[PDB]
Amino acid sequence: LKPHLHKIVNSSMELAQTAKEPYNYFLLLRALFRSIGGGSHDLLYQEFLPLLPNLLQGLNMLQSGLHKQHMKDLFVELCLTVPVRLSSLLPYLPMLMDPLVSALNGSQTLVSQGLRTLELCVDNLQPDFLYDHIQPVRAELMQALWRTLRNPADSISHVAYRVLGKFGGSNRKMLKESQKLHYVVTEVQGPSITVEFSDCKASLQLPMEKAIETALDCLKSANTEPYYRRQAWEVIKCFLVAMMSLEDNKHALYQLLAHPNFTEKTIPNVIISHRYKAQDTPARKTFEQALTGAFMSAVIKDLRPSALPFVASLIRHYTMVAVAQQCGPFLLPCYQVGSQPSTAMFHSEENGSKGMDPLVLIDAIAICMAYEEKELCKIGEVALAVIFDVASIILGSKERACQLPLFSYIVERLCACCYEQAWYAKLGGVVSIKFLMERLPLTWVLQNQQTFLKALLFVMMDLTGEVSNGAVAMAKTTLEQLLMRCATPLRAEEIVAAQEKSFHHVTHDLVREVTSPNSTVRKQAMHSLQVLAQVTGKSVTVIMEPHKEVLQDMVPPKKHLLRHQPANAQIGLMEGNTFCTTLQPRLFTMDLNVVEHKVFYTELLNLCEAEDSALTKLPCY
Amino acid sequence: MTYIEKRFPEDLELNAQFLDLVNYVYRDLTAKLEPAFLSGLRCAQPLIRAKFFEVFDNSMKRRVYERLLYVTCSQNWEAMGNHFWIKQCIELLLAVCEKSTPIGTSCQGAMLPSITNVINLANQLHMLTNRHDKFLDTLREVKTGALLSAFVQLCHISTTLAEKTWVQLFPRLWKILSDRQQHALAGEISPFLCSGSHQVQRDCQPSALNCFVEAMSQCVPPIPIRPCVLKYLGKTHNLWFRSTLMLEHQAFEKPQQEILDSLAELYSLLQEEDMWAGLWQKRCKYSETATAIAYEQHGFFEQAQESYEKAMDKAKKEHERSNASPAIFPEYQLWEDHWIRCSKELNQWEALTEYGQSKGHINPYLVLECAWRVSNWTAMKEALVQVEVSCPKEMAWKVNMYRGYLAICHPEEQQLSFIERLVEMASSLAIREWRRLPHVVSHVHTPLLQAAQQIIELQEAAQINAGLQPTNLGRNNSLHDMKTVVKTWRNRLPIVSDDLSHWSSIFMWRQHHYQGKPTWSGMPSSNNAMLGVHASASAIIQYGKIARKQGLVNVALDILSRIHTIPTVPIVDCFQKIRQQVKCYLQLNECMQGLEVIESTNLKYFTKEMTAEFYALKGMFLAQINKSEEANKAFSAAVQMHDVLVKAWAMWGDYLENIFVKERQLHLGVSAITCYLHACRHQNESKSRKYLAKVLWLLSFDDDKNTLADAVDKYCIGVPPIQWLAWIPQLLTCLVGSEGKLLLNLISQVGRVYPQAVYFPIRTLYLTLKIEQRERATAPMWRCSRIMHMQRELHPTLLSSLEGIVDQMVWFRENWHEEVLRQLQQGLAKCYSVAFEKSGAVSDAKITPHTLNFVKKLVSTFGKLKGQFTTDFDFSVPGSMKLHNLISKLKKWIKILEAKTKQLPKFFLIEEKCRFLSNFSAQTAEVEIPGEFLMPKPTHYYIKIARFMPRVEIVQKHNTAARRLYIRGHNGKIYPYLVMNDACLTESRREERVLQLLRLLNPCLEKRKETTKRHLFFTVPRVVAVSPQMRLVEDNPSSLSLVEIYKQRCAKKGIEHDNPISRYYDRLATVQARGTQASHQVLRDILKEVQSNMVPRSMLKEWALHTFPNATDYWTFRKMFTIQLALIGFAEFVLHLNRLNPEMLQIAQDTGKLNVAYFRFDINDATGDLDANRPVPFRLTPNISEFLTTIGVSGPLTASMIAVARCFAQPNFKVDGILKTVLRDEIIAWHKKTQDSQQLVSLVQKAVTAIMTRLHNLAQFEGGESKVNTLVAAANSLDNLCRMDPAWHPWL
Amino acid sequence: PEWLISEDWALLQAVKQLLELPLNLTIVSPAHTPNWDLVSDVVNSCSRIYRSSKQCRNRYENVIIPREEGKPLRTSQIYAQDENATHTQLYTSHFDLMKMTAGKASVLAESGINYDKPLPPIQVASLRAERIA
């Protein structure tokens, strides 16, 4: 096994990033470490040493990031338990410490694993050296050591207490970072439910902040018994039908929604945005938490029969509220023709909407998308269709319902999921882009064409590290379809103008990204033009011709001293130059005689001809 | 039922349901089946639970009052001790509601509006609307009983919900009860709390009583609870801080002393000695007790012990003539308890053991602790047996250990075979109590963490004796079991903050084995006797080493006197003895004795390295006394003998500098510079800033021919550049000034290794000089450029990334709306400050020339069409005649723009408007977190940049809007940085200066005990500036300034935060208009009336109470708040800093840390007078004091200020060097602003000597309380407050 | 183990915070379950040696119950009569115990050092470099 032992680990780590299901790749290492660990420790241990820097740095990066609970539990386990004895691990010890604090939190088997590694490290590293390496993490490590004493498992506590004793005085040394305290920022009454007794017919208002959160936590939990799941659903349901005011019926409702004007008048062009959302006040925070509880209670079996007909009928209600609040007939003043995305459209404690805003539904839908358990995307995707369906029916036309100000928030909020650091949160965004693209009118997609393009590129750019359980692979496909959906030639003047304008903007962004240092986004930007070159009859250079202003100062590198940029950018400048020139129309003829071209051409030459290490190994290199 | 439950916990379904059928038999007495019926109420199967509930629900009236009595009095909760039985109580009461009424909610504001509600504010469709009405029709059928049934069930599975429900429930339904019912209910509640049924529930963490007692406290009509029981409940049910907090409240407002006794004991139990001390100083009858406590509170246990003994005899004279005066007994008990404590800290273990076993009134507990420390085991065994019978408390963990001590060090012959159970039993028992302590670890937790170190030592101590047994003695494995464990002990020590008594515990216990070890080797080529004696010799020296570090020198001499008894010591250990002995005399006719030991020792034998250190001590000791010329040769011989001893080099330099400061002898200065730099050479990182500070300080005396600088340049080699990182701003101030070309050879070496550390400062300086020059390349600018030039050649990738980051920074500057509003806020503050200066004179006053330029500059940037035509019209002239009329105009325009900026975006993504930051990644370039190099941290501990989070939030800072961009370090943590953009670069640089000082002083606090014992540090934020204008400040969210607290509750109130200042001036004008000048009394009147009408005394307490509902969180936040304000208060006074305006103090809600918003030295513009003598020495104010008055101000604050002041007073910490260097740079900046040579020395030297005057004046300890008590009393005295600037918000 | 008088009054008052004379005459109408730990806690405020909860109950049920019943002076009446003299006598005796306890250079020449003449650091610094050479 000594031969191609590096290939197993080196490939496993790099493959795990791109692969859709990395869990097997990391489980492979866990199997490897157990087998090698304590069973074959003559040559593999020596053969393992070269792997330690990248491997520990790798594994350290993964646990530092945020993945699914079961995934994270494995990661902290791999950072520890490596088949390297006490010695030869000290140089990389700082990288191991961050897992150690993580281990002391979480699963019991991890806590014991964390103490087990900490226990041995305490005895063999002499206090002064070990404590120094604990300084970066001591603020949270010690608080974890103190906390684990209170844990119920006696074996965990006794071991935790023993190590604290071994930490002679360091266990009680003053902490630069004090223990974080729990403070309530909002001094307002949260959501409550009227309760009346027979005693002098007096009434109370028992707060529901914990109950709704507690009920939701039960639905999140993967091992709550079915009875309490049903009760959790009942608490959430009974609360929603409490905050939701039932003050309309049939004739009163029909006349408002059968009105002229809002079915014929131009829909007001108001842009919503959570940029101006002051803060999630406790009601809105609870209301959003209550809704995501309703959405989750719909997906899980043995509760869908009484939930899906509820959430489905509830989603239709909120959209009817949103439309009636921001459509032709009356609309609140915050949605008038020339208004701006003020805070009046979000619930707030000083200038809210004097009543919960319907947009909290979109927040609940977005949070369901970003939930780690991706099964919730399906129920959320149902909601997006339902609000669109009600909007189409109530406004009398598809493209009209899409012009509604509500969808300006949906595109913004769901796209925001692509800017979260968790891969699952990002994947929730990309899936949302795919759904909206394929179920919405072409012209509207053109209106939000660029917004999706930028978000998709960010997901790919952001995930150059451990990519995902298949996100960029999903992002690239969605990006490809997005250009194909929009760039496909048609036929009315209105649509033609939008496509010509939208196509103009998108190519501007793609050309800008040709030379970008990020390899993942760069190559796709290179490839995204190719699909455009095929979708339409226009040649690649004809597509890139108008936006020469962008790349103009780089294809010819403008003698930007070719050391003041890192290696990654130098690849982008060279790769962008290669792609730009290689096109058979060959934009930006790189004439040697012209200045700042001979320089670039000579530099890449000397770079290639550099034979020895010293000349090849420059400070940038 | 008793047997079935325990044996088979999975088949109770058949039985549990059976007892439900027994409900019929009870009516048709078998009452003894209650402890199974109650176990059926909890169960785990929901179906059975409801079946048992119906009989329980049936058996009582459907009245809220009756059920409350039933839960309190009628019911017994003993049967279900392990359960959190409050769940049933929540279920019991929630079952009395009206389950039929349709669901609703009082908070109509939060309800989602109905579809048709928009009207009131003024085919596919019909099927949908018709279909929808059915859905709404179903909702109308939901009844509140549906929620309560599900609500109640949800509690049973989640204690956290149950715990929060009862606290939110009982006070709410407590209102429902009529005042008659509440009266009777309160009568039953008091006996209920102290009932014995809850006794079973002490161990379980969320104790049912803990949640119950927490709930009642919120009841709006206060429920009277005896202080005696409140102490008990706090002690047992982990309810510590709610009891003390609740006890404090009544103690403040309200035979009225039983409260203090209960409160006093709890503070002692919590080990909050400083808070405990404050309480007793207020109530102590005898003046002796206050003197004793004040001494004991800080150390000097020699004085405190005597002050107690003085009190007792004087009290003894009282007894023979007077009666008992029952109230005095707790005071007498205090002296006996604390005279013993001080006796322990004094190492008077022999006397205590003799005292403890007196003829009568024996004290077995006292004998237990002290008897074993001396070898009097026979007394130990006797004491242990008679205390085991009454081992009453947590001590059980302590008692169990002492069995091991007797087991190991048996009076005749040990067994050490069953000890494993003993140590394990004690360890488990110790953890048991730990579970009973508060949530946040604090001083109350110290004994357990303090003990954990010694409980383990007992276990591995048994391993020592096991090896000594002849059965396994002499074996190599056992011998190496002896060696390693002894080595482990030598490196595992407590911290200096630990009381010397515990330090004895670790070492006295270790001493026994260091004496058992020689015995086995005394039987043979057995050198292990040398190892054993070496251990005891080193251990006793180490144990006595701290006694000096603690300030108890006299006992330290005694401990170092013990080693003489041991027959032989390794010569290396004896060198520590003399070094520790000579150090002891150095810290205190004492010269003769010190000179006796130094001369007598080392008659003819020692090695080179140890001789030098010894001879080094001679010079420093000689230097103290007048005889000094002999010290020089003592250093010369010492330094040159070893030539690599930092102490010789450093101490020698101090002598040369001490002489050279007078007579300005140039050749001596280079002698001082050479010594200092060489000392810092071998020394790495810390413990060299003190020496470097001198080198930079002495560099100011350099003449035109830069001899000292040449001396620096010649000998600044070898000193690793890391040591310089602390002095980058000081170096740059030298580089920009004259003779910089000499230092440029040094900075280039510092930058060559830490490019990010110098580039950001150097970039600021060069760009700062350029703008300075452009106002009207120069050599200083050329010097800065040369550093960057070469510094770009190396790490070219890193520098490009840095500049790229700064280039993108320009996009974070606030828009015009915020920019102008910032000018208004700045202008208004200056007008108020100018306005106060013009007070007393005509209140109308006149607009100052400086104010005109700002307003004239304001219209220039303003002159937005709708606003424009109004502002220019309103500001028809840049201030017409009246200053106090102008502020009204600004305030109106403050409100206009403040609302205007309220609608501005709170978000804007990085990828938008700036691409480099978003495209930045770890592989782009290794760049450390901004401000990482501000302090040369010795260890690696450097966090790279990995990703600029794509979202930046726009936030308000005191009087400006700043962009907060979140960084993600390579470690995965998120560091929120706040991009501060500001003009007036000269002021900004000064603000960083004081922060450098506070960062330089922080290591000072750690070393000593009386400061480390209180967790004292300056929490200086990390600020690195990259511009002449903008800078990055490490802002942690949730930190809101004190003034913002006033606005928050002011906004809730029906007033505006600026009403106090306006009322102060207009009220002053009315009296001034009549003709009478502003007298002192009228200043008190306006302050008093404002404090009683618009700014209530309890403003800050109200916010803290509502923001920290959890008791444990409130106290710790208050304690940390009080401690931090002490350092701020001390720093604002001793360092002669700018006054602490309300907007300056930044309170961190998450941790309680207070960091002042950019302090700065208060130097007179005309001259470097350094005038900081405003009426109140430091901000104490009513509201802040109201947070802490009775104890917090007295005990913690006064003690905290004294502890810090004494810490800096230590001659060992060369604060003179630190202040002189930093101030020198400050003075240079002052000179440039006001418009070199030795005249600089006069300003800085006179300034520092002014600072040390305050430091020593308020640090010196007299025969009683220190001078701090006077100023803090003067700080909050209304006489000084009313005289302060109204903009300072003295009322606040 | 030394018995006191004021501690008996502490026992009485502590019991008055819960039940009645025959401790649980009926544990009072409701179930309040006397808490001897609390009674032991309060009595310790006026003592220097812990009165364990188990032993605290025995003293109440052994001597206090008969003495309180009477039908010697009542425990309330002895305490007033004593004038707290015993307790003062106790601390006065303790104070005496504490007070009574409270009563108790040619080596340099052999190393090449010309100790008579100091060497300025400049020469010493230069001398240091030479040894490196």
Residue numbers in the entry:
A (entry chain C): 732 to 1221, 1226 to 1356
B (entry chain C): 2400 to 2427, 2435 to 2528, 2586 to 2717, 2740 to 3008, 3025 to 3089, 3096 to 3283, 3293 to 3379, 3415 to 3786, ...
C (entry chain G): 2366 to 2436, 2442 to 2474, 2495 to 2523
What text comes from the article?
The human Tat-interactive protein, 60 kDa (TIP60) complex, a fusion of the yeast nucleosome acetyltransferase of histone H4 (NuA4) and switch/sucrose nonfermentable related 1 (SWR1) complexes, is involved in both histone acetylation and H2A.Z-H2B histone exchange and is essential for cell viability, playing a role, among other cellular processes, in gene regulation and DNA double-strand break repair. TIP60 can modify nucleosomes through covalent and noncovalent mechanisms by using its histone acetyltransferase (HAT) module and its E1A binding protein P400 (EP400) chromatin remodeler subunit, respectively. TIP60 consists of five modules, including TINTIN, HAT, TRRAP, ARP, and BASE, each with distinct functions.
This fragment of EP400 corresponds to the SANT and HD domains, which interact with the focal adhesion targeting (FAT) and Huntington, elongation factor 3, PR65/A, TOR (HEAT) domains of TRRAP. Of particular interest, H2397L and R2413Q have been identified as cancer-associated mutations. The robust interactions of the SANT and HD domains with TRRAP tether it securely to the rest of the TIP60 complex. By contrast, a long flexible linker of EP400 connects TRRAP to the rest of TIP60, allowing a far reach of the acetylation and histone exchange functionalities from the site of recruitment. Of notice, the SANT and HD domains, which follow the EP400 linker, occupy the footprint of the structural component SUPT20H on the surface of the TRRAP subunit of the human SAGA complex, thereby preventing the formation of a hybrid complex.
